[model samples]
Target chain A: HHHHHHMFYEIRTYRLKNGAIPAYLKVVEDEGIEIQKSHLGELVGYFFSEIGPINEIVHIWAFSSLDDRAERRARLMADPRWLSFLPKIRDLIEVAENKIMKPARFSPLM
Target chain B: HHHHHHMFYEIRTYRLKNGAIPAYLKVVEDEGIEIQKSHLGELVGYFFSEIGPINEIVHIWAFSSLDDRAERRARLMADPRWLSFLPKIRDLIEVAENKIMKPARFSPLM
Candidate 1:
């Protein structure tokens, strides 16, 4: 069997205030994503709930290792662009949860 | 600018019985994943929690559309292989949640 290398995934789940999704997404689209990408490196997927949880947004990011994730998040927090962008959606979210995950050997995204 | 085509994502979150992950993953790797892939199509990622939710597993699958997702899942459920594989991890799960999501315009996985 071939050796498999798995990247670390950060699954960030956010439950935004009711009816705030449109405005929240607009802000992220207009200013947040670019700044986030610049610091985060890889944006695996950015999504909002359509069927299960209402007012929820989920974003996945990949990193080479756990330390890499920590470093990137630190940089993103320190960046002036991210700082400026944060306020736009800060009040929009009602709850936030972050999960660190390791891919299965058969995972395509690994 | 190019027109962006968004894909639908099904985020399945499972809270397994305590200490069930290793055995569950072993069975999936040995018998279940291939059968699932053959019927389910694209598997975006398969992961087990490392930091957030304890005893949790999350898998993300991508579909061209909501109808495509419905059709594919129906096929997967009907497969004999899937039926045979079900018992291997059926009792291992404690909670199951599914969320349907649409990718953001700049999402890399879309």
Candidate 2:
């Protein structure tokens, strides 16, 4: 008998203080973690009623399991380049939110 | 009797030619279509082998069903503002890819 385990997806939102995108991208780029996708706009609706920051950064990631994510994160944190990159614009990031998503029932089109 | 219909998710990738960001945003803003997220970096693994253009844009959208997406799209296409917006930067977009997705086993955390 063979059992299959599905990979998990994560949707993360990062709200930068003002002009931290440059530094943020540099840091993540230097570290080796991959970002699946990013779209800039609304959580729901257009204008009228916006949620959270005026500038929002959203992206997705994939992992075999929660443990896999933890392990990879630890590796990233341990990287010296990532550490140096963080301080360059740490203050620029006001908030960081991570949401675990498994992709909707009508997904999986890669 | 009540039946629940799950909302569908769409992942889109837009590869812009040169400096087309300004025009791209203008079109979407006028049409009232909301963007969910925007992360600028890697599709998979850093350095080693980067996919597509150096500046890539990815975003997601949600709809009640396939027909809902078609209806909303038709409305957007019929807008005159969107029509003029399309010509301004139509040539600048190298590629447009759309993927429809369903939430996996774990999702819907809003």
Candidate 3:
């Protein structure tokens, strides 16, 4: 038997009203964490089946440990810059959802 | 005008052959990163619309910079432990997709 440690990942989804993506993005750019990989898609895979919203935003995060995540998130939340940025467009997002996942068997890389 | 740095997030999805999720999770546990927040669902929000497979997995990751992502990913890929774990269930995953997103205007925190 072989032992392996799984990589932890999170998926957060946001529901936005029409014409609000730009404002949302701008606010996020001002206060959110920078990402290295990014892509905009035409709803390939199962996401195409989602109904109700004209547009959706999805993203992933990786962590070395649960404690590491806790520390960083605390810092992000405590940052005054992020606090002021949050209320600027507080009405644009309708709902937020989060999910956690591990890799699948046959995954090519970690 | 206010200046802010956006937090970058990524979402990755995996399609699995039936009964393969456990194996995948094990490999990830062995070679993958750790996450703090996690949840299992009864199909709320938009996920209820997905048509294929009885189960789905999702996760997110955060980065300080794009360069940080590149460097960390490079290390993960080059790690020998992850390589040996890959072939264990290479046939179980059917597809893989990734998405990048920024926070919406209504986001409460960074």
Candidate 1 local lDDT, B1-110, one digit each (tens):
32367777899887888998999899999999999988788999999989999899999998888888778878987898898988788768755668887777677877
What lDDT tens digits, residue by residue, belong to model 3 across residues A1-110?
Answer: 11276555666676564335666777666654332112111111213112223346676666555676667667766767656766765676667798766666555424
Off by over 4 Å in 2: A1-110, B1-4, B26-53
TM-score to native of every candidate shown: 0.50, 0.37, 0.39
DockQ for model 2 equals 0.02
TM-score of chain A of each: 0.94, 0.63, 0.68
Question: Model 3, DockQ value?
Answer: 0.02
What tens digits encode model 1's per-residue C-alpha lDDT throughout A1-110? Answer: 32367788899999776557788999999999998898889999999865676568999999988888888889999999889888899988868999988887777888
lDDT of 3 by residue, B1-110 (tens): 21267555655565566667777777666554331111111111112114665545565565555566656666654667655655654455544455655656566423
Runs with alpha carbons beyond 4 Å of true place in candidate 1: A1-4, B1-110
Candidate 1 lDDT at A101 equals 85
Model 2 chain A: ten consecutive residues of lowest lDDT? A40-49
Task: Find the candidate with the highest TM-score and give its number.
Answer: 1
Better of 1 and 3 by DockQ: 1
Q: What is the C-alpha RMSD of each candidate to the true structure, in Å?
A: 17.4, 17.9, 23.8
DockQ of each: 0.08, 0.02, 0.02
